Ligand binder design. Structure first.
Ligand SMILES: Cc1cc2c(cc1C)N(C[C@H](O)[C@H](O)[C@H](O)COP(=O)(O)O)c1[nH]c(=O)[nH]c(=O)c1N2
Ligand SMILES: Cc1cc2c(cc1C)N(C[C@H](O)[C@H](O)[C@H](O)COP(=O)(O)O)c1[nH]c(=O)[nH]c(=O)c1N2
Ligand SMILES: O=c1ccc2ccccc2o1
Ligand SMILES: O=c1ccc2ccccc2o1
Ligand SMILES: O=c1ccc2ccccc2o1
Ligand SMILES: O=c1ccc2ccccc2o1
Ligand SMILES: O=c1ccc2ccccc2o1
Ligand SMILES: O=c1ccc2ccccc2o1
Ligand SMILES: O=c1ccc2ccccc2o1
Ligand SMILES: O=c1ccc2ccccc2o1
Lengths: 359, 359
């Protein structure tokens, strides 16, 4: 089965092609993770996936999505990850982390607590920052503060510091969160970036924050560990062919700047869109990026059945298949997939205290 | 759904009728549990089951089954359970523990490391003890040492100390392991007990170790927390009607001695048997014990599908359904069962960071 073939990228070898993508848990306190995350992540690692990427972890307090988001903006925050990294490795999975800044989508309630921008008088909220003072709209009406050049320098340095901390906490894979309408995606998109300085206007200028952040992170992130990013390559906003072309050009520049793999996603930059949700819907788009940028890719958003995952790999649409919600439902999804695909000794996807009894 | 109705026993309320029975992990070191157990147990508790009973935990070093078995024979061993108990409670499940002594089946290899008695010259092994100097046979050929009266007193006191430690570690449910051919079961069975003192011969004498241990534990175990036992009520050895009758009489004596619930199992006292493995095969036997002893019961050994579990409850064969291997395969089995049985808001069997996305 293609799904169960190992994958090597730089010095890291994944035991199979199942990746658990970053999934926010909304359970941290002032950015500090706790035994929620420890058990959640260690349990997933034991389930058999080759790669486990920790949820969007804020590079700065104002870059959290919500008051429950994880952070890595101090050494104390980083040290909280050390035992979790060690548990993921003990289970034979590769520990990764997504480092993030939510931009104009920050200062929001948890999804089961309203999912909307926090009220002005709620003591939990904060001022958001963005390339331009324009609100997302809908349930996120807060107008962000337009960043100064010094803000841009500061946030870049926060990504560098976050990457350094991740490295020293023992992560073996990093993902820069340039997707989903958060700060990086919002610099790239003309919907959200109306700047007239070096960081807006032209393709080169809109790309600049992302490319400069990648280059700065590259200075501290080891060359022998995968350096990756998540990026929304289209919006489903009626501008798809032009946006895809620009996204592919940016992907080429990321590759030239040392990116090892791209997680291909949707922008979610604005609310007025028509995303065609369905099984494996991102497959053809991921394949086009893979082919036109000549870069390994993963994607998600409906690949969470064993046959869909296998088909995507065999068609060379993807190099890794990211499976999210199915792992919330069943942390041992990789074992389920091994059984479904008829892998020999499928139960040994799991550790011995489980595998022995399930054979 | 009957499976999702709460259950109250003494001062403890279970959120549903799904119990996770004790399942040895073989991952402890000199009896001390570690992050294997912490993550395993906390993850299961979060999966939604109402009751989680920790694996057979030895009351004394020689009462371990294997070198990987958990122990509770010192205060340091007990303290290792405290954070796990706290994690189980944080997840809304009730923490229980099975306290045990493997008797003649002790000093064995882990099941995936031979499953047989440890070789005489292996530095990991030890002398086993039992009511009589008679080997189990087959893959467990070691002849145990016949216990003295002082050994009997000592082992009883070890059960008392174990129960006291469990209480002080915060467990809310205790199960005395009098099943599966281990020390207690072997005192009851005429196959293994050939003693001619007060602890063998007659029904009263063969029952004596078990009843005395129950009474001694009762002196330290709080009256407001369930006091339970697991007991093999037949062997499938050609003596089933007579053995069942005696087992039911003993169950009546356990009830009179303060037992709140009986986990009805098979003896496994000797190898030469013909157990009719199959779906829910213990249902009729459990129902007979429940009715003839007038005691709540659980059982296991093939109830691990949602419809089988529901049927057993609706037929009043069982009060709780124990589901073992299905939980090794899928720690979120309770959520799977809720979905299968059409429970409203099935995803809220799980905690919010999972439930919200699965509705
Ligand atoms: C609970 C939860 C939380 C998050 C997500 C999703 C879910 C369900 N997603 C998106 C996620 O990585 C993935 O793309 C989607 O879940 C789609 O894949 P599936 O169809 O669920 O396999 C996500 N994406 C991301 O880049 N960073 C994140 O931290 C989060 N957080
Ligand atoms: C890995 C493992 C380890 C154990 C068990 C089983 C398994 C699979 N079983 C028996 C268990 O509680 C249960 O009765 C059986 O698994 C049958 O139920 P299922 O058909 O698996 O739901 C068990 N029983 C017991 O009384 N104490 C224990 O510690 C163990 N250990
Ligand atoms: O202590 C541990 C923790 C995790 C683990 C995972 C797989 C195999 C063995 C393990 O041991
Ligand atoms: O980047 C993100 C962060 C959170 C989140 C929650 C649900 C779906 C997608 C998401 O993406
Ligand atoms: O920030 C985000 C981005 C995407 C998304 C998709 C579905 C649900 C929630 C989401 O949140
Ligand atoms: O592909 C999808 C479709 C819906 C959805 C909702 C929440 C989170 C992730 C999701 O992914
Ligand atoms: O810290 C925690 C740990 C476990 C847990 C389980 C359910 C809900 C909330 C929880 O918080
Ligand atoms: O009491 C026990 C202890 C271990 C064990 C292992 C497999 C099956 C049943 C078992 O019962
Ligand atoms: O001690 C035991 C008792 C029962 C049993 C049943 C199946 C497999 C292993 C077992 O071990
Ligand atoms: O009902 C059963 C049947 C087989 C079996 C084997 C190992 C452990 C538990 C088991 O339960």
């Amino acid at each position: 089965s293609a799904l169960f073939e190992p994958y090597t990228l730089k010095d890291v070898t994944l035991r199979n092609r199942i990746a658990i993508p970053p999934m926010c848990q909304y359970m941290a306190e002032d950015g500090m993770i706790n035994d929620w995350h420890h058990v959640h992540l260690a349990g997933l690692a034991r389930g058999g996936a080759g790669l486990l990427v920790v949820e969007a972890t804020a590079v700065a307090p104002e870059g959290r999505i919500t008051p429950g988001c994880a952070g890595i903006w101090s050494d104390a925050h980083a040290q909280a990850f050390v035992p979790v990294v060690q548990a993921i490795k003990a289970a034979g999975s590769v520990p990764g982390i997504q480092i993030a800044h939510a931009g104009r989508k920050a200062s929001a309630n948890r999804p089961w607590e309203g999912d909307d921008h926090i009220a002005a008088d709620d003591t939990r909220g904060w001022e958001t920052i963005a390339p331009s003072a324009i609100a997302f709209g809908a349930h996120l009406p807060k107008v962000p503060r337009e960043m100064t050049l010094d803000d841009i320098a500061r946030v870049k340095q926060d990504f560098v510091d976050a990457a350094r901390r991740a490295r020293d906490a023992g992560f073996e894979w990093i993902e820069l969160h340039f997707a989903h309408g958060f700060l990086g995606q919002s610099f790239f998109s003309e919907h959200s970036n109306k700047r007239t300085d070096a960081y807006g206007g032209s393709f080169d200028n809109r790309s600049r924050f992302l490319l400069e952040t990648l280059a700065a992170v590259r200075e501290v992130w080891p060359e022998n560990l995968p350096l990756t990013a998540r990026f929304g390559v289209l919006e489903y906003d009626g501008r798809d062919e032009q946006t895809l072309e620009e996204s592919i050009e940016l992907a080429r520049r990321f590759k030239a700047g040392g990116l090892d793999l791209l997680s291909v996603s949707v922008g979610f930059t604005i609310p007025d869109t028509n995303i065609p949700w369905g099984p494996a819907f991102m497959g053809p788009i991921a394949e086009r990026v893979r082919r036109e940028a000549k870069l390994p890719v993963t994607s998600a958003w409906g690949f969470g059945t064993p046959q869909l995952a296998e088909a995507a790999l065999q068609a060379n649409q993807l190099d890794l298949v990211s499976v999210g919600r199915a792992h919330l439902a069943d942390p041992h999804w990789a074992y389920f997939a091994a059984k479904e695909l008829g892998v020999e000794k499928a139960s040994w996807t799991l550790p011995a205290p489980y595998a022995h009894w399930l054979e």
